[PDB]
Structure 1
Amino acid sequence: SVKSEYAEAAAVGQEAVAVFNTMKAAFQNGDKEAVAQYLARLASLYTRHEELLNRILEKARREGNKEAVTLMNEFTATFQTGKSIFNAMVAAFKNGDDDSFESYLQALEKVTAKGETLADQIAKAL
């Protein structure tokens, strides 16, 4: 089964949600020095999670588990959307563009919330 690997990856996703939430508070309360620290931490988490998730997908394929593959592909689509928005948010922050940063923040909050729910549905199904 992929349960061990799924839980390992889910803990990384849980950290990304918590870090995102604190980063939002820092940005909207004017602590931009702190925002940069949280963006760097999120870059690590997105990198770690991407690689673990792709390995779970590949393991579900090696195990011949159609149900698992389907669910992990669905999670991947939402996960990779977030990673792309995150990359654009980092670029906006580098350029001092608060308007773009806030738009990307709102988009990422909704994508991460949807992924969080999806991750719950996957945990119940494995």
Structure 2
Amino acid sequence: SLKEKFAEYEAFGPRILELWQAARNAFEAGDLARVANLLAELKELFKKDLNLANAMAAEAAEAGNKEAVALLAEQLERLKKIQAMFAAAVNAFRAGDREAFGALLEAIINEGKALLPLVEAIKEAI
């Protein structure tokens, strides 16, 4: 159900943000084995998050909820942008490009913080 999906999507956002900030902490403390573990978890979580977002968008479309289709489209743009920085952040971690990885962590986390207040919008729209 659409509201049940949204209940699940709503919890993903703050967990994902937590993991990113933990990844920065682990990186700044030089704990690369932990950074890699966080990245793996984030890879699974982010996959599920984006799958849920896509499923909710198609469901809202079925129901003719034009208001929810638009809010969900904005969330998918932000998530696509995050996915691209994520790919680049992974590449930088593997090359050991510390400045690129740090600069990409800041910008991913600033995108993560900006998703959260938009998410409340989708709640009332469904």
- TM-score tier by shorter-chain length is over 0.9
Q: Which residue does the alignment assign to 2:25?
A: 25
CA distance in 2: counterparts of 1:107 and 1:8, whole angstroms: 25
CA distance in 1: counterparts of 2:22 and 2:104, whole angstroms: 16
Supply the RMSD in Å over aligned alpha carbons: 1.3
CA distance in 1: counterparts of 2:55 and 2:67, whole angstroms: 16
Give the deviation of 1:30 after TM superposition.
1.5
Structure 2, unpaired ranges of 5+? none
Q: How does 1:38-77 map to 2 (within 5 A)?
A: 38-77=38-77
Partner amino acid, structure 2, of 1:44: E
Q: Which residue does the alignment assign to 1:36?
A: 36
Q: Which has the higher contact order (CA 8 A, sep 6+)?
A: 2
TM-score normalised according to structure 2 size: 0.93
SS of match in other structure, 2:96: coil
Give the deviation of 1:60 after TM superposition.
0.3
Q: How does 1:87-102 map to 2 (within 5 A)?
A: 87-102=87-102
Query: What's the % identity of the aligned pairs?
Result: 32
CA distance in 2: counterparts of 1:78 and 1:96, whole angstroms: 26
Runs of 4+ in 1 over 6 A off after TM superposition: none
Q: Which residue does the alignment assign to 1:80?
A: 80
Equivalenced residues, count = 126
SS of match in other structure, 1:114: helix
Give the deviation of 1:12 after TM superposition.
2.0
- 1:108 aligned onto 2:98: no
CA distance in 2: counterparts of 1:68 and 1:77, whole angstroms: 14
TM-score normalised according to structure 1 size: 0.93
CA distance in 2: counterparts of 1:76 and 1:7, whole angstroms: 17
Q: Deviations over 1:46-92 (max 9, x none)?
A: 11111111000000001010001011001111111111111110111
